[PDB]
Amino acid sequence: MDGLELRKLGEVSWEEEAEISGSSARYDVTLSEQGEFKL
């Protein structure tokens, strides 16, 4: 209970029949030195 444990769930690959979703758009954002993204 002191650290985190790893479990394998799959392997990285490109599935040819994979379902398509999402939307394509362009956003201009600012990035802080702490890796934060904001519009």
Binding site: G3, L6, L9, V12, S13, S21, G22, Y27, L31, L39
Partner: protein, 154 residues
Amino acid sequence: EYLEDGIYGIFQSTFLGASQRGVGVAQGGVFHTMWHVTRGAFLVRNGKKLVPSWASVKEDLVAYGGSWKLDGRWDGEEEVQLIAAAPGKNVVNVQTKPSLFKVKNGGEIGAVALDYPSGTSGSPIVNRNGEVIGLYGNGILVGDNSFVSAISQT
């Protein structure tokens, strides 16, 4: 002793049980995940303890057990795929036409508009060849409050 290449889930153990806090990818002997998932906490593999070997807070990436070994980079026009290891759900691949983040006083980086829970952070984004272009989990909320992540790469 060498972590088998593939996608791993990060699990945290509390008095209320085990929960998948995030995912990472193993490739070439090193474990790669988003910095916000672990914030440098150590891992365990069959009693083998892994400590962070490199981290960058502004890239939000951390590697365990060696240098950063993911070399894929987005071309700018390929359709991309997100292998989403959502907590408690079967691993599913989702393909998308990427979005783009134009950073003020900087350059362009690709983004994916797919909304997945916390604990899917660190999932791999890959190109048509199957090489890893970046990790998922760092992004913005847009007007409709959906999440849009950046294809986080070094």
